[PDB]
């Protein structure tokens, strides 16, 4: 199934864990986009005092991501594999809007979206859309249209703290290798060499100036308030 | 008789023999008072200062063992307190008169 | 006794001995390996007051194998671990087909055991001061 | 085989390897394994002298297996009184007798340090110890056979022998390595990694020898061979555990009050009675018909099984009496003889145990006989053995309604024999002054009786770690460097995984003689650095004073480049020997070399200073070569060499 | 003693009972040598109460007993509700049947 | 029935490919869990008897009750004698037995019901001893029921 | 709670609310632009609603003309995430304001708790053999309010209230005794500061704080 | 019971209808009554072939009364290949490129002899690689220490 | 608002309460409003009501 | 730390854009283009040593 | 054992290429430092008694 041309899909969801599907809420395109694009932004704090040659830079935030792509709808009859329909592209666009745009009275909002094509997998919200109608039948039925789309990114707050596995607050263990000293190991774990007598008391060490090269030590966290 | 959570204090300051930084400052103060006519360079590349820091570290080690509790410092290899103390069963009871 | 925050508990297929009146227990890395066996053996709605516990790998039965599927499989596995097993970090997921005819899909998960204690790890003498209720 | 659609979890699976690629760090490992079988579930060994490609430990474990269980683990317990309280000391010393088979451990280190696919050649499979103090030995000629075999494979580039250091003599060890160096020169495409025989002064039976001086005298080949290998020193201490079986570990027990005999004797007094064996012995001494019969057979079978279990319990306690009766060996003998006689009713001499076994097999067959014929329900008793097996318990019980005519019987000789055992054991009660309750028992056995002691013992056993020669870790390290930078990059200043420390510390005074020496037989050092751990220091060959071949990376680069060109020129072998061919050969070789130059292997500002190729009549060939059919191609190369020393200088000016 | 026990090395064949799983409650085995035939539980109840006191908040019971005893403690709230039925019954009769 | 399929103690069983040892372990767990079910079943059973315990026509002979549990797949093999599962009265005598001090408990119930009418039978406690010996306990309970 | 976040019952993706007047919900045609609620020690609680209204093409204000936001009516405000609502404020409507600008037209509705009854009239009275907490209960019950007042040890033989409101008199007397006044949902509670109870949650600079101000003097 | 419905000595498999928690009633299994067969055990494989064969058969009707020679043989091949390449792109046929998915052979000395030309026969040989479903998922776990 | 469902085989009362209210803890109020005593086993033709939560 | 030849730069990422251009038929990408912007970092102890500030 | 390798008073010694004079000076330093070690050793010894 390497030889199969895969087509892009969009599915709508009801919950923020993406496990409860909206009924009849799946869109499949008939022509793939040419390309797609991502955007990444990191913000810093850049205040400095006058008279100085450089500023003290501090990380502030990671801003949300962005995806963009374009679509083409056409039912003229020159693309192999598809049929000409009596009403053209009317039902294709109406089903596409019901999935990505329309307000849902069960959840009091528009839908959660999952976008999958090949290696790509993206969860989020619609922000912007433009649809332009190009060709028509003599009685005013449209047969060609072009759409531009912008998607934001969604992370649930319970999953953000699990991805930022934030760790002087937790407990730690190491094994002593030959070449280790107690004040150098304390500096790499706490940021300061001065806690070496508290690490030695918590492990029952008397001759801490010579460590034996199979010992497993504990490193307790610092106390708060 | 349950296990408690274990942590380490953050105010590492005592102004005694277990306080490395305290000892180092006192060392330098004494040096100036006694020998500043000849020894004035107190930068970190100086062998003199290097020796001082090593000795301060050694002092902390000594102080730390002095604080080991009595139960261990006077323990016997086989356990017990035979040559150190008389026990209540032996030293408190009285002959009946 | 350094590695006491991984904890101790019942073996999954609990076995009862008669040479001593006890149920076998597991610890450390052994305990972690059995946790993984449990998680991927149960469906999302099977626990009573834990309506979101388990995995959805069964959704992919009776389907062809391709790039889109493989991407989806990896996502399912990684999310189940992030929500339910605080003691490990996945290293690599290798998905391959070993049979031209038999309907078999082979998935090999490799992982690393954490040296520091997670804020989601409910082990008795630790969570009281380092984690949630 | 699966039958129902679903998700399954398996501990052991087979993987589908499939794509080979050209690599430069491919070792062959020649040595002994647990087994050697093509098919995971057959009894035959058929891979022994058939070199096989392995991608991971996961493949090795399914064809060759794991490690051998150590037989040298000793556990000793001592009971003493403190102010009236008991205090137990647990002592588990390092084994002095260890298994000689190291391939499994070596592979774990190889993969841990970054090794890729490799070749395995077994020279045979593991055998047994003769005693707890007598390990199996290694036959030199087995390794020579394996070397002769690998000689015929084209892919391997590195040669290693995981069990070479366990050969009985150093003379055999050196002979094996001289052979490998000669093979490398014969083939022109391999490199040998060497270890010393030992890291400690070793005795050859005549004199005490220093390992570095001994290796240098041992390898007595010339430059033409020495350029094909390198040696490393010392051995390294790793973080791997020994493999063992708790059931096989016997615990010694010593105590202030001897209670070992007393325990065994009290258990035997319980044994010699109606609640242990008299009740057993008194009771022991057509589809419907089958069902009724089968029930009656099962009843007898169950009774026999209880009698058999009784025998095993007796042996377990009597043996502690024997083990504990250290003094007065006359009693040890009396106890042993009484037990040995008792066992004759259950063992091959008159085997109650096989009667019980045979009745079980017969019982299944008669129940299944109903599957297809009335004949089976007859044959199972009179053509087959149900009649014959019940006879072995009572020779002719059928003679009367009350069992009679017992011309022979397997039952109740037990009564007298138990009395003899107890009487002999009781003789030890005033003899045994120092053994405790667990003396002479197995580690697994104590787990029910005691648990604190059991867990303590296991923790102490697992504190002992494995020590290995460095060559297998180096093969791993070579693979990493070849992938990260290329074959022309030196292997030195690279850290090792799973290493706690070098076995010995080598001072600077010593280290200078390892790097530069009158013989050129340099040895690379393994060293510990503060804040870094264990690093490889130095990367020279056994021809370390040579102007062209002293560096490992230079020699390995050439082996690689020559092989690639050789393959590229095969397409011209049967072409006409004239100008239209000579020009095509040149263009191709130059294209290979220009890529190596851009990659950073070759030295020179522009190609004119990096390499050249010359082909032609009047240049490299004469009229006679054209007539013979020869073609002569001359190639020169400028290569990059490493920096080993850094020299600093300072100077100043006043502002 | 009324329930079979199945060893892990037999193909679902019974061998004995569950007697050994509660043997650590009674400190004097004399009192339970024939427990299924007793008509006087005063001595037995006494030893059981000592056991319960000894391990209360000790942290030392084997896990299968830890669950069983915790369960029995949770049931005390059911006893409290269940024993209020006699009052509810009386009030119903005087107030809803007799209308007083 | 509240556990997952993975545990193997549900109606659909456990797939054969997982081997005998896992099937055996499932049986061990069923045994263990019956210690919790037999107690809960007793409490539900006790609710079903409130009508009898406080009856004006005739009370029961027992004051504690139990039930056979039959919604478990192999109870005929788990129990040493399946006979008891066919009759809850025999099961009660075997599992609770003497722990049910029926004479004292039956008197307390009867005395409460009699008290609701402001009556009092205390004197039977000794007056009947001039007529009967140990047999008074049965006689007195019969008379109290007749009175109500 | 060391989770690094703020514990809520639902996702914070959708905020919902309800406005109830005299027991029932205002019709879903009214658009509420903004809601504010405040509470503070020793003050009477308040709330504000901003409702869009007015049409120049009709010459009128339909919400203002309704009987929903008329002074004297009882109001209740509930809020939560994904319809998991909880009560925040209860009180009575007091004011109605209109504002018109070149391209804007709104209605603003204000309300307060019932305690407001104690701030409207100056009084004069003699008290007799009462403790301060007996006096505080009397002042509150006079307006039909619920009360919970900590006791005091002292007893006055006479005390005089003169030409002041009940609220102001209550505040003067209460401070003199070290007490704080907490008013919440129609109940007036008078207690000493409680610094001993368990924290409700943890708020952290590097994880949950949006803004922060602090001072030492 | 279910294992004997899926795999059996006779090959006469039966598909099961099952209830799953939180899902309701699902169809479990999709095999034919020749369930042990190496080519025809799956329903989808057998139905695909019936479809593909009917479509090709109709496409070739236009050549029935044409001359039996090279100018016809080539036209028949081109048409069949066009049908099959579309099925390949659609995901029905297996193979990285057409050379591994299908072939068509027509010709004298390949599929026909002199006697067939005289009789009026034309022999066309077609081969197809098809996609088969996954029925089982096998997991494995392994670890390393940090 | 108010809601009704029909019980299918495979349904449990705490899982259905979670999908309607967002929380599994209301299962004893749903069982009391329907007159259910044995709610741990539902019969597969029953129609249940799900009342809304009270507001004040 | 960014090193190429004579260049050596320390800092942090501010901005990134990635655009995907060619694909295999099953949706595997084989070509992409990325634009990047990096800021500059100096630690405060090193700033005062580089500004050797010297009437004092 | 607390000083750097440069000083030359540690177990691995000092490289031969640095000459005799530097090796001699290392010997002189070891002598000097023993005045500090003998005193510290006494205090530890006194605890043992």
TrEMBL record, chain A:
CDD domains: LysM (cd00118). It comes from Algoriphagus machipongonensis. Pfam families: CIS_tube. Residues 172-219 form the LysM domain. InterPro entries: CIS_tube_prot_N, LysM. This is LysM domain-containing protein. Transmembrane segments: none annotated.
Automatic annotation (TrEMBL), chain C:
Residues 27-117 form the IraD/Gp25-like domain. Pfam families: GPW_gp25 (PF04965). This is Tail lysozyme.
From TrEMBL, chain H:
Residues 37-141 form the Tail sheath protein C-terminal domain. Belongs to the myoviridae tail sheath protein family. This is Phage tail sheath protein FI. It comes from Algoriphagus machipongonensis. The lineage of its organism: Bacteria, Pseudomonadati, Bacteroidota, Cytophagia, Cytophagales.
Automatic annotation (TrEMBL), chain K:
It comes from the Bacteria. The chain holds residues 394 to 442 of 933 of the full protein. This is Uncharacterized protein.
């Amino acid at each position: 199934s390497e030889g199969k041309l895969e087509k892009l899909r969009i599915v709508a969801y009801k919950d923020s864990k993406f496990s409860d599907e909206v009924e009849n809420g799946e869109f499949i395109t008939l022509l793939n986009p040419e390309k797609y694009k991502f955007q990444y932004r990191v913000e810093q704090n850049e205040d400095q005092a006058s008279g100085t040659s450089s500023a003290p830079i501090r990380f502030n935030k990671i801003l949300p991501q962005t995806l963009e792509f374009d679509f083409l709808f056409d039912r003229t009859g020159v693309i192999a594999g598809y049929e000409v329909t009596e009403d053209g592209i009317i039902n294709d666009i109406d089903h596409f809007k019901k999935v990505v745009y329309d307000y849902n009275g069960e959840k009091h909002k528009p839908n959660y979206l999952m976008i999958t094509w090949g290696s790509l997998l993206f969860k989020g919200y619609l922000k912007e859309m433009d649809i332009e109608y190009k060709l028509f039948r003599p009685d005013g039925t449209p047969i060609r249209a072009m759409a531009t789309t912008k998607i934001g990114e969604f992370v649930e707050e319970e999953l953000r703290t699990a991805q930022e596995n934030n760790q002087p607050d937790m407990s730690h263990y190491r094994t002593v290798k030959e070449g280790d000293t107690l004040p150098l190991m304390t500096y790499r774990i706490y940021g300061d060499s001065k806690y070496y007598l508290e690490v030695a008391k918590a492990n029952g060490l008397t001759n801490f100036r010579r460590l034996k090269t199979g010992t497993e030590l504990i490193f307790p966290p610092l106390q708060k308030q | 008789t349950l296990n408690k959570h274990i942590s380490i204090p953050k105010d590492m300051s005592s102004k005694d023999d277990l306080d490395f930084h305290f000892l180092r400052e006192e060392g330098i103060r004494y040096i100036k008072e006694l020998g500043s006519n000849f020894w004035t360079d107190y930068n970190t590349h100086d062998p003199g200062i290097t020796m001082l820091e090593v000795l301060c570290y050694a002092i902390s080690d000594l102080g730390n063992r002095i604080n080991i509790p009595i139960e261990d410092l006077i323990a016997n290899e086989e356990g017990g307190v035979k040559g150190q103390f008389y026990k209540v069963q032996e030293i408190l009871p009285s002959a009946p008169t | 006794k350094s590695k006491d925050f991984l904890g101790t508990g019942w073996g999954f297929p609990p076995e009862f001995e008669t040479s001593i009146g006890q149920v076998k227990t597991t610890s450390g890395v052994e305990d972690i390996q059995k946790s993984l066996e449990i998680l991927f053996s149960t469906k999302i709605g099977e626990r009573i007051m834990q309506p979101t516990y388990g995995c959805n790998l069964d959704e992919l039965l009776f389907s062809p194998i391709n790039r889109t599927l493989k991407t989806y499989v990896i996502e399912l596995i990684k999310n189940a671990i992030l929500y339910h097993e605080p003691r490990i970090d996945p290293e690599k997921i290798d998905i391959t087909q070993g049979n031209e005819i038999e309907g078999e899909l082979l998935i090999h998960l490799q992982y690393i055991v954490r040296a520091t204690n997670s804020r989601k790890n409910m082990v008795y003498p630790f969570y009281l001061e380092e984690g949630t209720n | 085989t699966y039958k129902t659609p679903g998700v399954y979890i398996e501990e052991i699976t087979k993987f589908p390897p499939s794509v080979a690629q050209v690599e430069t760090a491919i070792p062959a490992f020649i040595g002994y394994t647990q087994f050697a079988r093509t098919k995971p579930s057959v009894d035959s060994d058929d891979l022994i002298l058939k070199p096989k490609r392995i991608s991971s430990l996961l493949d090795f474990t399914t064809y060759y297996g794991g490690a051998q269980n150590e037989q040298g683990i000793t556990v000793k317990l001592t009971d003493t009184l403190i102010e009236g309280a008991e205090n137990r000391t647990i002592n588990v010393p390092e084994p002095t007798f260890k298994s000689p088979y190291l391939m499994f451990y070596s592979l774990q280190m190889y993969f841990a340090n970054g090794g890729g696919p490799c070749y395995i050649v077994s020279t045979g499979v593991y055998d047994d110890w003769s005693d707890s103090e007598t390990p199996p030995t290694i036959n030199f000629s087995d390794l020579e056979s394996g070397l002769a075999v690998i000689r015929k494979e084209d892919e391997p580039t590195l040669l290693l022998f995981p069990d070479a250091t366990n050969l009985p003599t150093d003379d055999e060890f050196y002979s094996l390595y001289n052979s490998a160096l000669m093979q490398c020169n014969d083939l022109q495409d391999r490199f040998t990694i060497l270890d010393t025989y030992s890291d400690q002064t070793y005795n050859d039976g005549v004199e005490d020898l220093d390992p570095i001086p001994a290796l240098r005298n041992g390898i007595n080949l010339t430059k033409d061979y020495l350029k094909y290998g390198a040696a490393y020193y010392p051995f390294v201490q790793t973080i791997l555990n020994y493999q063992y079986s708790a059931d096989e570990i016997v615990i010694q027990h010593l105590s202030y009050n001897p209670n070992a005999i007393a325990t065994a004797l009290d258990n035997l007094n319980a044994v010699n009675g109606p609640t242990f064996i008299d009740a057993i012995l008194d009771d022991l001494r057509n589809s419907v018909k089958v069902a009724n019969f089968a029930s009656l057979v099962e009843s007898v079978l169950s009774t026999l099984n209880e009698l058999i279990d009784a025998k095993e319990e007796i042996n377990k306690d009597v043996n502690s009496a024997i083990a504990s009766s250290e003094e007065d060996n006359a009693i040890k003998t009396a106890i042993s003889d009484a037990l040995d006689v008792f066992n004759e009713d259950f063992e091959g001499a008159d085997k109650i145990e096989s009667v019980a076994k045979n009745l079980s097999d017969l019982l299944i067959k008669i129940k299944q006989a109903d599957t297809n014929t009335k004949v089976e329900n007859v044959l199972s008793i009179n053509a087959l053995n149900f009649s014959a097996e019940f006879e072995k318990l009572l020779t002719y019980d059928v003679n009367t309604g009350l069992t009679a005519s017992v011309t022979l019987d397997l039952f109740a000789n037990i009564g007298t024999r138990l009395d003899d055992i107890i009487a002999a054991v009781s003789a030890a009660e005033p003899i045994d002054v120092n053994n405790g309750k667990l003396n002479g028992r197995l580690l697994s056995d104590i787990e029910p009786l005691d648990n604190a002691t059991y867990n303590t013992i296991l923790l102490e056993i697992n504190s002992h770690k494995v020590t290995l020669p460095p060559s297998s870790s180096m093969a791993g390290a070579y693979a990493r460097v070849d992938n990260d930078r290329g074959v022309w990059k030196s292997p030195a200043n690279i850290g090792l995984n799973y290493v706690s420390k070098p076995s010995v510390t080598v001072s600077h005074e010593e280290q200078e003689s390892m790097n530069v020496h009158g013989t050129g037989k340099s040895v690379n050092a393994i060293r510990s650095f503060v804040g870094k751990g264990t690093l490889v220091w130095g990367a020279r060959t056994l021809a370390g004073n040579d102007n062209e071949w002293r560096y490992i990376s230079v020699r390995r680069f050439f082996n690689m480049a020559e092989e690639s060109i050789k393959k590229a020129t095969e397409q011209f072998v049967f072409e006409p020997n004239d100008g239209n061919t000579w020009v095509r050969v040149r263009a191709m070789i130059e294209n290979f070399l220009i890529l190596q130059w851009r990659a950073g292997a070759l030295a020179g500002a522009k190609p004119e200073h990096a390499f050249y190729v010359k082909v032609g009549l009047g240049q490299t060939m004469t009229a006679q070569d054209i007539l013979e059919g020869n073609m002569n191609v001359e190639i020169g190369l400028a290569v990059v060499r490493p920096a080993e020393f850094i020299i600093l200088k300072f100077s100043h000016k006043m502002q | 003693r009324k329930i079979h026990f199945f060893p892990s090395d037999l193909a679902n064949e019974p061998l004995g009972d569950w007697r050994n799983f509660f043997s650590t409650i009674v400190s004097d085995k004399t009192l339970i040598s024939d427990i299924e035939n007793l008509d006087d539980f005063e001595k037995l109840r006494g030893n059981i109460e000592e056991f319960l006191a000894a391990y209360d908040q000790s942290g030392k019971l084997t896990p299968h007993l830890t669950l069983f005893v915790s369960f029995l403690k949770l049931l005390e709230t059911s006893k409290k509700r269940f024993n209020q039925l006699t009052k509810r019954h009386l009030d119903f009769y005087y107030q809803e049947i007799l209308h007083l | 029935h509240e556990f997952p399929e993975t545990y193997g103690i549900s109606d659909i069983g456990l797939p054969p490919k997982l081997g005998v040892k896992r099937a055996v372990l499932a049986r061990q767990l069923k045994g263990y869990l019956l210690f919790f079910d037999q107690i809960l079943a007793s409490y539900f059973e006790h609710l079903s008897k409130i009508k009898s315990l406080l009856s004006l026509d005739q009370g029961p002979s027992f004051t504690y009750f139990t039930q056979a549990i039959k919604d478990i797949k192999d109870v005929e093999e788990l129990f040493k004698d399946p006979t008891l599962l066919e009759n809850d009265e025999e099961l009660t005598k075997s599992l609770i037995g003497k722990l049910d001090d029926t004479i004292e408990r039956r008197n307390q119930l009867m005395d409460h019901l009699i008290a609701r009418f402001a009556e009092n039978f205390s004197s039977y406690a000794f007056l009947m001893k001039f007529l009967y010996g140990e047999s008074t306990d049965e006689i007195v309970l019969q008379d109290k029921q007749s009175f109500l | 709670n060391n989770s690094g976040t703020i514990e809520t019952s639902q996702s914070v993706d959708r905020v919902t609310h309800k406005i109830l007047i005299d027991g029932s919900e205002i019709p879903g045609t009214y658009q509420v632009k903004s809601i504010q609620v405040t509470k503070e020690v020793n003050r009477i609680p308040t709330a504000r609603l901003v409702i869009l209204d007015g049409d120049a093409a009709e010459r009128d204000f339909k919400v203002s003309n309704s009987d929903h936001f008329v002074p004297g009516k009882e109001i209740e405000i509930t809020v939560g995430y994904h319809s998991d609502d909880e009560t925040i404020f209860k009180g009575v409507v007091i004011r109605q304001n209109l504002k018109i600008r070149n391209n804007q037209s709104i209605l603003i509705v204000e309300s307060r708790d019932m305690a407001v009854k104690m701030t409207l009239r100056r009084k004069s009275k003699y008290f007799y053999e009462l403790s301060d907490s007996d006096i505080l209960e009397e002042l509150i019950s006079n307006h039909g309010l619920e009360a919970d007042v900590a006791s005091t040890e002292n007893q006055h033989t006479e005390l005089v209230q003169y030409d002041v409101t009940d609220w102001d008199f209550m505040m003067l007397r209460l401070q003199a005794n070290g007490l704080l006044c907490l008013v919440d949902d129609g109940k007036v509670s008078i207690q000493k500061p409680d610094l001993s109870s368990e924290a409700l949650e943890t708020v952290t600079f590097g994880a949950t704080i949006l803004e922060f101000d602090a001072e030492m003097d």
